Amino acid sequence: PFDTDVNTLTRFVMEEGGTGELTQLLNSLCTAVKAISSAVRKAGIAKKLDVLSNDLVMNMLKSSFATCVLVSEEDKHAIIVEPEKRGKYVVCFDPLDGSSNIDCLVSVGTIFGIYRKKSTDEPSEKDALQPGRNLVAAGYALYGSATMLVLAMDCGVNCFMLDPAIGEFILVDKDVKIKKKGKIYSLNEGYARDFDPAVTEYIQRKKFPPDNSAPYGARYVGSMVADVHRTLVYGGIFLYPANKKSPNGKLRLLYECNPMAYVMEKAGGMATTGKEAVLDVIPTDIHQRAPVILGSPDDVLEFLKVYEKHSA
Amino acid sequence: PFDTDVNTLTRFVMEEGTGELTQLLNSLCTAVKAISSAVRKAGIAKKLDVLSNDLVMNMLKSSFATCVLVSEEDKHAIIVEPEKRGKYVVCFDPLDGSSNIDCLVSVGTIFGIYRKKSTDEPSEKDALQPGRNLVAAGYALYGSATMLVLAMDCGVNCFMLDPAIGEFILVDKDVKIKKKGKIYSLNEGYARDFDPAVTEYIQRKKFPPDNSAPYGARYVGSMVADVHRTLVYGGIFLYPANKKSPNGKLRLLYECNPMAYVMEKAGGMATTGKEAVLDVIPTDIHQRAPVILGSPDDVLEFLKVYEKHSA
Amino acid sequence: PFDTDVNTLTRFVMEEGGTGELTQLLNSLCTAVKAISSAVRKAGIAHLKKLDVLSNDLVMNMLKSSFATCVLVSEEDKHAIIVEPEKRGKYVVCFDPLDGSSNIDCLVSVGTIFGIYRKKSTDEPSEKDALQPGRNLVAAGYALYGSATMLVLAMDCGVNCFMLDPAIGEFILVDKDVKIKKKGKIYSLNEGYARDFDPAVTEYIQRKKFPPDNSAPYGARYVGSMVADVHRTLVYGGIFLYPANKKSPNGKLRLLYECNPMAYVMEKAGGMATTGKEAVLDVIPTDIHQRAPVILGSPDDVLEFLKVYEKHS
Amino acid sequence: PFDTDVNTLTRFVMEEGTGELTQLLNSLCTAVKAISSAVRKAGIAHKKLDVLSNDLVMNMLKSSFATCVLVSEEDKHAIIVEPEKRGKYVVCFDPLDGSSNIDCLVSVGTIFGIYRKKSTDEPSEKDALQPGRNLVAAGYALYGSATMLVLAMDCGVNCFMLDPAIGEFILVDKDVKIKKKGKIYSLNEGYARDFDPAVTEYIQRKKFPPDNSAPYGARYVGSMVADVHRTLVYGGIFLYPANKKSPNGKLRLLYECNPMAYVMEKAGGMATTGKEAVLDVIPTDIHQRAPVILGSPDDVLEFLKVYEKHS
Ligand SMILES: [Cl-]
Ligand SMILES: [Cl-]
Ligand SMILES: [Zn+2]
Ligand SMILES: [Zn+2]
Ligand SMILES: [Zn+2]
Ligand SMILES: [Zn+2]
Ligand SMILES: [Zn+2]
Ligand SMILES: [Zn+2]
């Protein structure tokens, strides 16, 4: 019949360990996710969604009593939590990534990164300018044909599916590991005119393998969360690289790149800018961009060997 | 057109003040949502009593907030292993009214929470505390909507389950029962076994001495439904003692005490006839207690009748 | 895993048989029921009469849009509603959109009751087409919005129960050719009105509490919402009473959209439904909102009430 | 508050005109809602999904009393409906297109094409071998971040979103028209080595425009329903063309190409094999393949101008 020992995201977080603030934080975040999932599922019947999602995530995070500094893709400055509701965590989030293409029922998502406040001073925007290497937890919610929450922590990557009947995230995939080498490459080839020669050579090798091996398949949803999730589940490589026109790439470091890089690394994958690990970049602005190449370690290493040969 | 500042049961509990009570009530809400879903699909999918009991026990142990668990479905108290233990003692009725589930009658989960008072290892004895010691108590009613009624020192608040997002939303703040109602509730089928005070009291409701209008009668046969109606519309609910059942039928720990606590926190009353239900010092985890509860003026009217048939 | 041959209310109605208008009608009605169920389940979060009005509007709009109806009688409307010629069909529908709604705030089960007739007359549709005895019913039943949502449907072939599956928004067949127990052990009425009871009611109730034959006294149940009390009577057996007295010589319940549909379900389940003088289904109405006394349920219990009733005048 | 005049798929079909088409589309919607639910819970529950979806669609269609011949992607031969349940329509369907990549939560879908039986003999597989031009109705259900049913008929294309709260398809987009020219191209560029020169040249013009205009963006989900739906909603072009290795393309004519081509044409778009309209191909086998280039009329015409210059 029905399962009596329901393995929820809450139970999982509680089992991992201090004070209990991380559980409070992730529980509040799950409330926001469920509400966003519901609004997305009814979108047609009901920039509106970006604003609503941002408000939901901000309100739920402030009310958790677990956070002090909140950085969102939708706000120019960091939001400082009032002392009454404050906690010890710094949260960087992307409330509804992929929303520009919502009308085609493409998967959209909420991306998040959690840091423990490291400084000995009052909370400020500066507390969010930490390299992704300092992440305590990071992940995303994918609003697709099912709602999934992927959570990475020091112990690894775990996937939780939203059960619509009981409104709970259930553990479905334990200690997820990416394949060593995949057979799919993912990037917007529409920008080929602006590509760096290393990118052009790398793609050419995927379509025309020198070694008689089978050409890779191509997939590009245009929604970061969907493209990263497919990379995690099936293996392969995802690229949003730098070029002469965009020397720092297009994607945002704090709430797009770093969380995805952390999930990748905790799954046994890689995430590079080409020059260094995405997680090693020390940000100087909360909205700064970063180039990103991530996925299966053998595929990223192959890209890096091509990248090196087009370097001084 | 959607609310951005969602007022959940979790937010409410957190605002009232380690954080163990919040963890406890959050785990309980998970069990409630799962029970609600199973009840809503019962025919498409007795066994529900067992499932509900297992769900509530597993969720409570996993909260890290409990040390002693007493259920209507278990002979002895369950002691939580040291790894998962916390400071609270929980008495619960996982699926009250389940014998009549097939008629789509409202069923419910009743619960009572105590902070461990003793200075020793947790035991069954920690559950033998008068209802007066309750930290929190309430019920989930699985009816036309799913409602969670929560009573604490600050009062009674009602939360409705939002099916779209699986969260309990605050719908009724600091709930107060009417001073006097116009409905009486008991199984009149047992009239042959009634104590004369009960017979006289019911006769006064049907044939008022003062020319006032006779009260209406309602009896669902599901304690949570009958108590909830009493709270919302006022009046009186009776499951009293008689010659055959000198201690009543309902169970003190996980039926009477939680309902009595909700009643008192709503400005109502809950008596055995001799004393407040909350004042009975239990000696067995499955002991019975007579119960008369509701609108204070209605219960006082019953007590005046009860006194004249005493001494 | 999952069931591949889903037995829906729609499939069931289609299998029973002409033109296909009855299926269209019951499909439209199910849409209204699902929307009412949802609104009831969220009542406190949303609402903050409202639900009576909404339910009535939903049922009216869905029925008109089915292309299966010509005359609609509702508890909520003074006169019958005549369907515009464009959307006209051959059925007459009497309904109670949200019976028990006065007590909605206590999460008591509420319900939608319905009765369907074929227009018998050779003239233009009018209110008069709804003034037909229950014996003429083609289909009748109710939706119960309780701990689960159930649709009970009676037709010439019998009574079938369908439960709403919330995951797929469809009514699934759960109970085939439902029959009430010959004799039950529960009686149901508002005993608060004892002062106004006719002696036959008083004596009957006394026999239930104080059995002459040493048998066990019956249990009492009274929800105060007709659909809940009738449904419990169907499922567990027993008797339900809303009888006539000196003050209300015609009873309290409404014949067209409360009594007749419930009486039809009862008779099709092997039970009984009487006014005391005749079968509820045999009353020829003269007004769309006329009242009728009703005693229904297990055939042995209703017969036992009638034996007491016969001894009086 | 709540909308009282609910505009459902059923109401819409009934308004367009025995009533067999309504019965057929209503049964199909039941199957779609059940597939949507199973997809939404896929991981919590468990090729299995392909089989389940196929069984659901077959059973619901047979039970509608509206069909006589059923062709599915999952069955080698056509299914002939038993005399008792027989109706006048022929249905070609793809029960769970894109299912090979289900685990990445990519949008999947059900594609369908409906024909009226034209022959005056006993029903057979041959009744399904009709050109897409003969379609009475066609469309798809997209199981994505929301569930949508896109329905094309002689009158045009209409989109219905599944309302999870009431389990009904609600009209959200009336008489849908594709943009004359889009700014997105969609194909698996991983197969570039096998491309015919006209495809290679066409793609090169999209990345390197001769006229100083902005290069097009690229999108390729790898699920036909998702890629076609994005093309309808935002405009542009979708290509699954013929090459030396696959002279007839990869996609199946009866239950993938023809339904998508009919939706495209009814939206003011185009759908070509390169030599003719997909809808004009006279099938000879139920599982035959067809090359397909579809979308915004100006974009498809621009591909055809390149195609014309080659052999
Ligand atoms: Cl591997
Ligand atoms: Cl029997
Ligand atoms: Zn973003
Ligand atoms: Zn109980
Ligand atoms: Zn009524
Ligand atoms: Zn007499
Ligand atoms: Zn396919
Ligand atoms: Zn050429």
> For position B273, which CATH number holds?
3.40.190.80
C225 labelled ligand-binding: yes
Cβ distance C245 to C96 under 8 Å?
no
Q: Are strands A292-295 and C81-82 parallel, antiparallel or unpaired?
A: unpaired
Task: Please name the residues in contact with C176: beta carbons below 8 A apart, sequence gap of 6 or more.
Answer: C160
The amino acid at A177: K
H or E segment and range at residue B24: helix B20-40
User: What is the DSSP secondary-structure string of chain C?
Assistant: ---SS--BHHHHHHH----SHHHHHHHHHHHHHHHHHHHHHHHHHHT--HHHHHHHHHHHHHHHHTT-EEEEEETT-SSPEEPPGGGEEEEEEEEEEEETGGGGGGT--EEEEEEEEE---SSS--GGGG---GGG-SEEEEEEESSSEEEEEEETTEEEEEEEETTTTEEEEEESS----SS-SEEE--GGGGGG--HHHHHHHHHHHS-TTSPPPPEE-B-S-HHHHHHHHHHH--EEEE---SS-TT-SSBIIIIIHHHHHHHHHTT-EEE-SSSBGGG---SSTT-B--EEEE-HHHHHHHHHHHHT--
Q: Are strands C294-297 and C239-242 parallel, antiparallel or unpaired?
A: antiparallel
Backbone dihedral angles phi then psi of residue B93, each to the nearest 5 degrees? -125, 100
> Which residues of chain C have a CB within 8 Å of the CB of D168?
31, 34, 169
Element (H, E) at B165: none
D 80-139 residues inside an 8 A Cβ radius of A: 101-108
Q: Which of B174, B207, B239 is the last residue of a domain?
A: B174
Distance CA A57, CA A35 (A): 10
CB pairs under 8 A between C and D: 93
Same domain, A131 and A277: no
Q: Which residues of B201-223 are buried (b: 16+ CB within 10 A; e: fewer)?
A: bbebbbeeeeeeebbbbbbbbbb
How far is A173 from chain C, CA to nearest CA, in Å?
20
Query: What's the CA gap between A126 and D167, in Å, rounded?
Result: 48
Interface check B244 vs C, CB under 8 A: no
Spatial contact of B104 and B225, defined as CB atoms under 8 Å apart: no
Is residue A21 marked as binding?
Answer: yes
CA distance C190 to chain B (A): 5
Both B163 and B194 in one domain: the answer is: no
Q: Return the DSSP state at A289.
A: B
D152 and D209 together in one domain: no
Taking Cα atoms as reference points, which of C15, D124, B2 lies closest to residue A36?
A: B2
Q: Which residues pair with C188 in a beta bridge?
A: C240
Identity at B283, one-letter amino acid code: T
SS3 at position A252: strand
DSSP letters, chain D, are: ---SS--BHHHHHHH----HHHHHHHHHHHHHHHHHHHHHHHHHH--HHHHHHHHHHHHHHHHTT-EEEEEETT-SSPEEPPGGG--SEEEEEEEEETGGGGGGT--EEEEEEEEE---SSS--GGGG---GGG-SEEEEEEESSSEEEEEEETTEEEEEEEETTTTEEEEEESS----SS-SEEE--GGGGGG--HHHHHHHHHHHS-TTSPPPPEE-B-S-HHHHHHHHHHH--EEEE---SS-TT-SSBIIIIIHHHHHHHHHTT-EEE-SSSBGGG---SSTT-B--EEEE-HHHHHHHHHHHHT--
Residues A157, A246 share a domain: no
- The CA distance from A61 to A81, in Å, is 9
C-alpha of residue C190 to centroid of ligand 5, in Å: 16
Whether residue B19 and residue A19 make contact (CB cut-off 8 A), yes or no, is: yes
CB contact under 8 A, B144 and C145: yes
Structure tokens at C281: 């289904």
* Domain membership of residue C71 as a residue range: 1-177
Answer with the one of B174, B205, B224 that is the final residue of a domain: B174
User: Does A100 belong to an annotated binding site?
Assistant: yes
Instruction: State the sign of the Cα–Cα–Cα–Cα dihedral C124, C126, C131, C134.
Output: positive
Nearest CA in chain C to A163: C167
This structure was determined by: X-ray
* CA triple C212-C217-C218, angle to 5 deg: 125
**DSSP three-state, residue A3:** coil
CA of A212 to the centre of ligand 7 (A): 30
Tokens describing residue B277: 């239900």
CB C159 within 8 A of CB C51: no
Q: How far does C34 lie from chain B, in Å, by closest CA? A: 13
Q: Which of C71, C63, C80, C70 is nearest to C26 (CA)?
A: C63
B92 beta partners: B71, B111
Q: Which residues of D are annotated as part of the binding site for substrate? A: 97-100, 188-191, 219-224, 240, 250-252
Are B188 and B167 in the same domain?
no
State the CATH number of the domain containing residue D78: 3.30.540.10
Q: What is the resolution of this structure in A?
A: 2.2
CA D217 to each of CA C252, D227, D300: distance values in angstroms, whole numbers, following the listed order: 71, 13, 16
Q: Considering only alpha carbons, which residue of chain D is nearest residue A142? A: D105
* CA–centroid distance for A209 within its chain: 30
Residues B127 and B187 in one domain: no
CA distances to C160, C176, C282 from C157, rounded to whole Å, are 9, 11, 20
Q: Are residues D184 and D277 in the same domain?
A: yes
**Tokens 């390169």 identify what position?**
D274
Residue from B6, B144, B238 whose CB has the most chain C CBs within 10 Å, to mutate: B144
Whether residues D181 and D118 share a domain: the answer is: no
Interface of D with C in 152-181 (CB under 8 A): 164-168
Distance from CA of C86 to the nearest CA of D (A): 10
Q: Which of B145, B174, B203 is the last residue of a domain?
A: B174
As a whole number of Å, the end-to-end CA separation of chain B is 63
CA–centroid distance, C232 to ligand 4, in Å, is 20
Domain count for chain D? 2
Does residue A264 share a domain with residue A145?
no
Please indicate, yes or no, whether residues C236 and C268 belong to a single structural domain of this protein: yes
The residue count of chain D comes to: 311
Dig out the tokens for A117 from the structure.
């406040």
3-class SS string, B257-310 = HHHHHHHHHCCCEEECCCCEHHHCCCCCCCCECCEEEECHHHHHHHHHHHHHCC
Cβ-based neighbour number of residue C264 at 10 Å: 26
Spell out which residues of chain A touch residue D191, defining contact as CB-CB under 8 Å: 215, 217
- The verdict on B144 and B100 lying in the same domain is yes
Chain B neighbours, 3+ Cβ pairs < 8 A: A, C, D
Question: Which residues precede chain breaks (C–N over 2.5 Å) in chain C?
Answer: 17, 48
If asked whether residues A192 and A60 sit together in one domain, one would say: no
b/e for A243-261, b at 16 or more Cβ within 10 A? beeeeebbbbbbbbbbbbb
CA distances from A189 to D216, D217, D228, D242 (A): 9, 7, 19, 21
Dist. CA C80–CA C77, nearest whole Å: 7
